[PDB]
Amino acid sequence: MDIDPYKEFGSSYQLLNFLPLDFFPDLNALVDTATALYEEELTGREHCSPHHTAIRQALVCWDELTKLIAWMSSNITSEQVRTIIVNHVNDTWGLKVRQSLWFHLSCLTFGQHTVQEFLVSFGVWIRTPAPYRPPNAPILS
Amino acid sequence: MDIDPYKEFGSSYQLLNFLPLDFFPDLNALVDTATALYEEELTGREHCSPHHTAIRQALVCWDELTKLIAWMSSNITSEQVRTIIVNHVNDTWGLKVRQSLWFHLSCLTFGQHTVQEFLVSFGVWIRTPAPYRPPNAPILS
Amino acid sequence: MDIDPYKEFGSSYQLLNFLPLDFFPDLNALVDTATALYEEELTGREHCSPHHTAIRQALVCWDELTKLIAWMSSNITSEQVRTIIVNHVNDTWGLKVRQSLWFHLSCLTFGQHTVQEFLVSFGVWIRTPAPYRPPNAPIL
Amino acid sequence: MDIDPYKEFGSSYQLLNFLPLDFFPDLNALVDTATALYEEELTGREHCSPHHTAIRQALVCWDELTKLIAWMSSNITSEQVRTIIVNHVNDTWGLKVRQSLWFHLSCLTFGQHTVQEFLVSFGVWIRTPAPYRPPNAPILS
Amino acid sequence: MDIDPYKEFGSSYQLLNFLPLDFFPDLNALVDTATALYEEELTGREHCSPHHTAIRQALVCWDELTKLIAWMSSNITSEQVRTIIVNHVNDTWGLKVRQSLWFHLSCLTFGQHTVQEFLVSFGVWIRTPAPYRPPNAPILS
Amino acid sequence: MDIDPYKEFGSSYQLLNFLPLDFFPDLNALVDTATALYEEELTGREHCSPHHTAIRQALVCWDELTKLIAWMSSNITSEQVRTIIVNHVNDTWGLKVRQSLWFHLSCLTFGQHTVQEFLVSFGVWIRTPAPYRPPNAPIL
Fold this sequence. Notes:
The structure is cut from a larger assembly and holds six copies of chain A.
Chain A: H1 13-16, H2 27-37, H3 39-42, H4 51-74, H5 79-110, H6 112-127
Helix pairs in contact in A: 2-5, 4-5, 5-6
Main location (chains C, F): secreted
Subunit structure (chains C, F): Homodimerizes.
Subcellular location (chains C, F): Secreted; Host nucleus
C-alpha cells in the first residue's frame, strides 16, 4: 500500500513538503554524522526509540544502493545510460534517504517536539516573500 | 454591517494594517500548510477553538473563488476583461484570504498570545527607518 | 482537500442541497436579519458560540462581493459582460452564503438540534413527490 | 452625539426599521388608541413606566408640527411649494412618530418582552418567501 | 521651569540622547499604532498608568499642530516662508512628539523595565565603532 | 481618532468651551504659578497623581513654542508675517494650554470633585443671560 513512514512520528510527506528539495544535506556528511554519534547505538542490542529503528533500515537502503551503483557501472551500463541512472537515483532514492536520515538524526539530537516546531516555523519562513523576510532561516539548537 | 472578524480574537484590521500587503505568503503554500497539519482537524467533528471555525469558512471562500475564476474564464470573459478581473480578485479577495489564513494558522501553531506580541513588535520594526534597523525582521518561533 | 462548512455542526452540504431556490430568503433580508437581531452579538468582543463566528466570517466574505460588483461596473465591464457575471455569482456564490446565513441564524435562534430535525423532516417532505406529500411544507 | 432612544427600553432603533414601512399604522388612528386607553395615565401625575413618558413627548412633538403646517399653509407658502414639505414631513417625522407611538402603545398593551418577540417573528415572516412560510402574519394577543 | 517629562518614568533627555534623531518612526505610523491598540483605552475613563496620560497630552499636542499647519498654509504664509516653517516644526515639534509617543507606546507594549534596558543596551551598540559591531541593532520583543 | 484631554477626569472639552477669554489668567502667570507652588512636585521623581503628569506634559509642550517664536523672528519672518502667526498661535494653541494649566492646578489645589461643581455652576451662570444672573460670577 501507500503508508507514510512518518505517520507514527507525528509527521507526513506534507510536513516535509514544506522543505524544498535543496535544503537537505548531502549523504556522506549525514552518514558521518550518525557515525560520529550513534555507531555503537545502531549496531547495539538496545531496542531504544523507533527513530533508532528507522535509521537501521535507512542505511541498509543506502548500503545496497551503493553496491547497486557499483554493480551496473562495472558490468552492464554504457556511459550514456549510466549517467542518466546515477542522476535519477540521486534525485529519487537518496532524496528520500535525505528525507529519511535528516528526520531521525534531528530527533535523536533534539527530541521529537523540537522537530515538530521546526518544520512548521520553517514553513512560515519559506512562505514569506523575499522582502519582509529575515535572512536567518531558522535552524536547530 | 461592518464587523471586524478579529474582534473576538483580540485584534482588528488596524493591527493587520501594521503588516504591509506584501508580507503575506501566497495562497497555495498556505493551503498546503493547513493541509500538512490540520486536514483531519478541519474535516473532523470537534468544535475546537473558533480559530478552527474561521479557517473552515475561509477555505470555502477560497474554494468557490477558484470555481468562479474557472467559470468566467471558460465561458464569458474575453482575454482583455479576464486578466483585469484575475488581477483584481488576487489583490482584493485573496488578500483578505491572506489576511485570514495567515492569522489563524499562526494561532493554531503558536497560540493566541504569541500572535498578539508578534503584530505589535513587527510594527515597531516597520516604523523604524532604514538606518538603525536590524535586517532580521521578527518572525515566529 | 475539501472543507464541509457543516461537518462539525452535525450537518452536511449534501443535506443542504435538498433545499430549493425558493426556500431561501434573499441577501438583503439576511443582511438586515443579522443587523437588527445580533448587532451587539456580532460586534461583540466575546468568544461566543461558533455559529456567531461563521456569521462573522460570512459577512466579511460577503462585503468583498459588494466591492467587486461596484468596481468592475464603473471600471471595465460592458452591459451584457457584467450581466452574466453578476447574475451567476448571485446564484452560485451568494446562494451558498444564503445557505450559511440562513443556517447559523436559526442555530442561534433555535439551536442546531432543532435545526437538524427541521431539515430532515423537510427532506422527507421534499423526498416524496407532490401527490404524496401535504401541500404545505414543514415550517417552524 | 446621536442617541437612539430604544436602547434603554430593552430594544434598539434597528429593530424598528427591520419591519416593512407600510406596516406602521396611520397616525390619526394611533392618537385615538392612546386616547381610548391611556387618557388618565397620559394626563395624570404619575411617574408610571417611562414608556408612558415617551408618549407624552411625541404628542407634544407632533402637535407643534401640525401647528407649523397650519402656520405656513394659511400665511405665506405657495401651494405646490407647501405640498412638497407636507408630504415630506409625513414621510420623515411622522414615520418616526409612527415608529415611536406604535412601539410604546404595543409595549403598554402587551408588555415589554412580548413586543420584542413580536418584532422577530413578524420580521422573519415577511422576509421569508411566500411558500415555505407560515400562512398568516403574526399579530398580538 | 525646565522639568523633564521622563523624570517620574525613570528616564531623562540624556537617556533619549543615546538615540540618534533618525531612529524614531514617523508620526502617522505611530499615530496608527496607538490607534490599532489603545483607541478605546485613550478615549476611555480609566485612570490607568500615567503613560496612558502622557499619550493623551501628546496627541493633543499633535492635533492642534496639524490645524496650525493647516491654518498658516491656507491663510498667511507665502510659499518661501511656509516650507521653512514646515521643515522647522517637523524637526523640532514632532521630533519631541517622536520622542514622546515612541517612549510610552513602547511601555504600554512592553512594560517599564523593558524600556530601561532597551535604552542602555542600544547606547552600547551606538557607542561601538563600525567594525566590531553586529549589524543587528537591538530592538524590542 | 480624537483624544479628549479631560475625558477620564470627569470633564469634557465641550464643558471647557463655556469659559470666555477673560476668565483665564495669561501664560506668564500660570508658568509662575506652577513655578512657586509645585517646584518640588514637578521636578520630583515620583509617580504623583496624573494632574501632575498633564502639567509635566504641558510645560514641555509649551517650551517648544517659546523656541519657535524666538527662532523665526531672528531667521525668516517679517514684521506683519510674524504678527499674525504669533497672535493666532497665542490665542488658539496657548488658550488650550491656558485651559489645561488652569485645570490641573486647581485639581491639585482643590480636587477635581470641587472643580466639576465649580464649572457646572459657572455654566448655569453663563448659560443664562446677564439680566437673569447675578452680576458677580461664581468664584472659589
